[PDB]
Amino acid sequence: RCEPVVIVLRGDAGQGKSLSSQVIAQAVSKTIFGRQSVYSLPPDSDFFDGYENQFAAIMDDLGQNPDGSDFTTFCQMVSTTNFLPNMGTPFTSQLVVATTNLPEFRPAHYPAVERRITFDYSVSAGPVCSKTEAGYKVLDVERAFRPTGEAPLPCFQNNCLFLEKAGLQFRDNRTKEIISLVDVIERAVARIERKKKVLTTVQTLVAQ
């Protein structure tokens, strides 16, 4: 049970946080595991009924359950120890994606997580897919999915502005760099390949 790679996506409503979470999970897991393998946690059910050791697991709206059944669920989901979600299936997902409304986290033991959090991104519609709806700025969904040519990675069936920082922007809350969803994926994939290169060097050290 190695530590999973964690991406947290921060943002306001109608910026595509959940769409992105899904499309980050499908595309990282398709690229490495070779297929989509996504479990989406249920909202307000401390029941991972449906979990079949999928490659990627999604949490919607961390820091929305007033009690904290989440956060703890989340904390357990990345301790190198063995979580056992209720039903006895074990928790093994190599990628965890969680979305939240909070610009930062404040639920005492929060910084003890923040090492666990590999990538911290704030999401907001890019300048040429930003629309207004009921007076709010939101991702232009109709414009951001129009096909715009050959896919920028094999796991995509085509390109579109959703995939480019002109359409949707991911601001790395630590490097303060601003990347596309494709970048978000590539970085997540690199880091996993690294964790697998290291792990292989560790189980090949002592001979068999």
Q: Does 133 bind ligand ATP (CB under 6 A)?
A: yes
- Of 4, 8, 16, 140, which lies in the binding site for ligand ATP, with binding defined by CB under 6 A? 16
Query: In the complex, what is the shortest distance from the CB of residue 68 to a copy of itself, in angstroms, rounded to a whole number?
Result: 15
Q: Is 12 annotated as a binding residue?
A: yes
Q: Is 15 annotated as a binding residue?
A: yes
Q: Chain centroid to CA 191: how far?
A: 13
* C-alpha to C-alpha distances, 131 to 7, 124, 149, 179, 180, nearest whole angstrom: 26, 11, 23, 20, 18
Q: Is 88 annotated as a binding residue?
A: no
Query: In the complex, what is the shortest distance from the CB of residue 27 to ligand ATP, in angstroms, rounded to a whole number?
Result: 16
Longest Cα pair distance anywhere in the chain, in angstroms?
A: 65
- Of 17, 30, 171, 187, which lies in the binding site for ligand ATP, with binding defined by CB under 6 A? 17
Q: Does 100 bind ligand ATP (CB under 6 A)?
A: no
3-state helix/strand/coil string of 4-38: CEEEEEECCCCCCHHHHHHHHHHHHHHHHCCCCCE
How many other CB atoms sit within 10 Å of the CB of residue 158? 13
From the list ligand ATP, a copy of itself, none, partner contacted by residue 157 (C-beta under 5 to 8 A by kind)? a copy of itself
From the list ligand ATP, a copy of itself, none, partner contacted by residue 34 (C-beta under 5 to 8 A by kind)? none
Q: Using alpha carbons only, how large is the chain's radius of gyration in Å?
A: 17
Instruction: Name which of residues 158 to 197 contact ligand ATP (CB under 6 A).
Output: 194
Binding part of the chain for ligand ATP, among 65-73, 135-143, 144-152, 182-190 by CB under 6 A, reads 135-143
Q: Which helix (H) or strand (E) holds 121?
A: strand 119-125
- Of 2, 102, 190, 198, which lies in the binding site for ligand ATP, with binding defined by CB under 6 A? 198
Residue type, 113: V
- Nearest CA among 47, 56, 43, 155 for reference residue 97: 56
From the list ligand ATP, a copy of itself, none, partner contacted by residue 120 (C-beta under 5 to 8 A by kind)? none
Q: Does 15 bind ligand ATP (CB under 6 A)?
A: yes
Cβ 39 vs Cβ 4: under 8 Å: no
Q: How far apart are CA 176 and CA 162, in angstroms?
A: 20
For the chain, give the number of residues. 208
From the list a copy of itself, ligand ATP, none, partner contacted by residue 160 (C-beta under 5 to 8 A by kind)? a copy of itself
The residues of the shown chain that bind ligand ATP, judged by CB under 6 A, are: 13-19, 118, 133, 136, 138-139, 194, 198
